[PDB]
Amino acid sequence: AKHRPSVVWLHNAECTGCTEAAIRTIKPYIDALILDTISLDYQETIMAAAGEAAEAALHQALEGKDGYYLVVEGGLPTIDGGQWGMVAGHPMIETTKKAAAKAKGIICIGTCSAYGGVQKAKPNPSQAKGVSEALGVKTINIPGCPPNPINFVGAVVHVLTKGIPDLDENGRPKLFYGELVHDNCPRLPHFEASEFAPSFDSEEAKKGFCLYELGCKGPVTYNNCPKVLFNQVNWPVQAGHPCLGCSEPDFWDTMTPFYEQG
Amino acid sequence: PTPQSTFTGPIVVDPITRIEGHLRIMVEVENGKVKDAWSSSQLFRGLEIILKGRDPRDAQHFTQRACGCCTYVHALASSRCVDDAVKVSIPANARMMRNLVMASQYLHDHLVHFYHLHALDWVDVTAALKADPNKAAKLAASIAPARPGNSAKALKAVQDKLKAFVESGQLGIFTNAYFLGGHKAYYLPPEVDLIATAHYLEALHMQVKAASAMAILGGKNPHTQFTVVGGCSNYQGLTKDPLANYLALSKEVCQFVNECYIPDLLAVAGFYKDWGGIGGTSNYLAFGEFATDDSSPEKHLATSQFPSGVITGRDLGKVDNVDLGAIYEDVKYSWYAPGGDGKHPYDGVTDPKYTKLDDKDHYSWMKAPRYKGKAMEVGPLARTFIAYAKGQPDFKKVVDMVLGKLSVPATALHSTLGRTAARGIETAIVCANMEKWIKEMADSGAKDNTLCAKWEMPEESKGVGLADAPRGALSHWIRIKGKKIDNFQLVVPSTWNLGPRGAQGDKSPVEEALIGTPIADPKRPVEILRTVHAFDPCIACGVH
Ligand code: SF4
């Protein structure tokens, strides 16, 4: 029996859509990943143990002799000593700090753990922070709301096998986030010809004209969506809807109003 | 008899795993049975606060992130709510597309819940290693349609994979499972454990297909991106090839629901018949879903094919109409400022104020939604009782099949067993309707591909968006002023089910359901998990 590398996965201030995205993986599927490639040693959404049995599983993984990698989903609520986000009676910021200390590497799955995410959007009532900010350490960011499983599983496999991938200024692997959404968009020839839909009901919209006039953030958003698709079938612009910019830091405040460019 | 210890004392389970979000359950146990209970939600994010002052068009994008398990549903509720507020009636094609996406979501959500969240409370996975795969195949052949996945060869393959994994000493997600070393509350033969484990693995693959179907119409899963004020954006979703692919994937998923999910559910139910007497509540509410007329919330309530209604005191003889004016939320036992009790959601207030862990006066970040003062269970069991009571012919037929197969009266459905069974029942019925709904939209779209209506943002207005999401009655309520969000309030099905006590100190549905729970082993309180999980809790949804 060859030892599989240990992965500890934490959920903080999150919607679980990142965990859901992760299990949409098909190269490999999630069962093959966790039976053959990694040892997923703590994962609240799917683990059998609950309560103190689950907390013990976490502590056993953190003390494992072969070490472990840390995946973090969700931002960290810091108001009131971190008490607005707790697990097993401990503030999320305290547990994440402890788990991060000994980690062989830290992967932030999603815009919330990478950058703060939806709970950090103004006026940020919980004083939410991204993981790097909260902990004061570099993180490998896999953003998107949620990221493509291709990007997250690809990053995980890359870290385990090849090394830490080249990151951009926002911590994102260039393998997946190196190109603008817009540069790979099938509607680009419409953009180039100034062929824009003025509304969703318009004939231009029906003909699949560019969505820039309807707020599309593709030209300022780094992600691989048109190249790889979601669920092997679609992506938002193909479904007739502008890109929200959801892999960009603080997009909730920098990319709104979503249906305009102003 | 049902295994029961003599334990007297407190039990706390935190984290509750195999749910969405962060839940602490506290119970008091006397002589092996739960005598009192508290449902304590442990994270606040504050989407309603965040939404203030923003463009109403943006709401659906923020509210969709209330939760990624019931992805879509909040974008739908927000779109319905803004539609109501601007007084736009969406085109027929957009009603059809939105409802199909909801259907696809029910199929994905329920399948993942039963196999990946709930089944580990009932199935001892390590006992599957003791099974004779020849005997398992024989049993599978008698209890379910013939399929190659159920052959001795296929079940032996699963067992060998499982054995290699367990023998590695790295048990991963099964580490410190409540079933390790055996447990009196786990009743299944090893053969049944093996069959269920084989399907758990297959379900991991099938849910990918369910999401792909959903994405053909929704743009991507999780977090769809095809809805707009006044309808949908996805013209491609009305066309021939995409719809053929959608139908093909939906049929594969439905085949799995009918071959694996329903037969596994019934098999499990048959061994745990005692759970038909544990975990019951009394009041049920639904706003309905799958409406033929979505031009207004009134028409939604009236024309929902999974009908709307209110049941009180288990009285199936009296289904009342939903009074939207009678809904309010309390905060007396919640982490919000005193002063906020009794608010209708158009007047809703979200003023967070934490005290301390386990404060019996304030112990949850969920508000307490009440209906003329009563707590209401929402979700598949609510929908099933309401539909059955109204004589909805699909629900009548499927419910009677289940009751016949289990040899139990309908009154046994007011329980955790019933709550679990109802989730399967309605999944089979969604499946039965998929092709009709797809053909309807295929034809409507061929006719005229209008998908979005024209509309104008009013200076001042209000509106409500209703939906029955996989977990139950969901409503979003907006006040618009100066063409911006002045108030935006979510009241979510897990808020109804898993919220704390209301202003009169009256337990929520989960807190009531937990009373009387036997505890065979206080160190490994699987029975608490069984009932909590039967509600399919979503704490990110419930608190937002
Ligand atoms: S990044 Fe988006 S999908 Fe992931 S946890 Fe945050 S809100 Fe949910």
Ligand code: SF4
């Ligand atoms: S639809 Fe968006 S990403 Fe595509 S060409 Fe237009 S602006 Fe660029």
Ligand code: FCO
């Ligand atoms: N289903 C679902 Fe999520 C919850 N509770 C919503 O709405």
Ligand code: F3S
């Ligand atoms: S909204 Fe996000 S999922 Fe891709 S198309 Fe835009 S970066």
Ligand SMILES: [Mg+2]
């Ligand atoms: Mg152990």
Ligand SMILES: [Mg+2]
């Ligand atoms: Mg609310």
Ligand code: NI
């Ligand atoms: Ni959900």
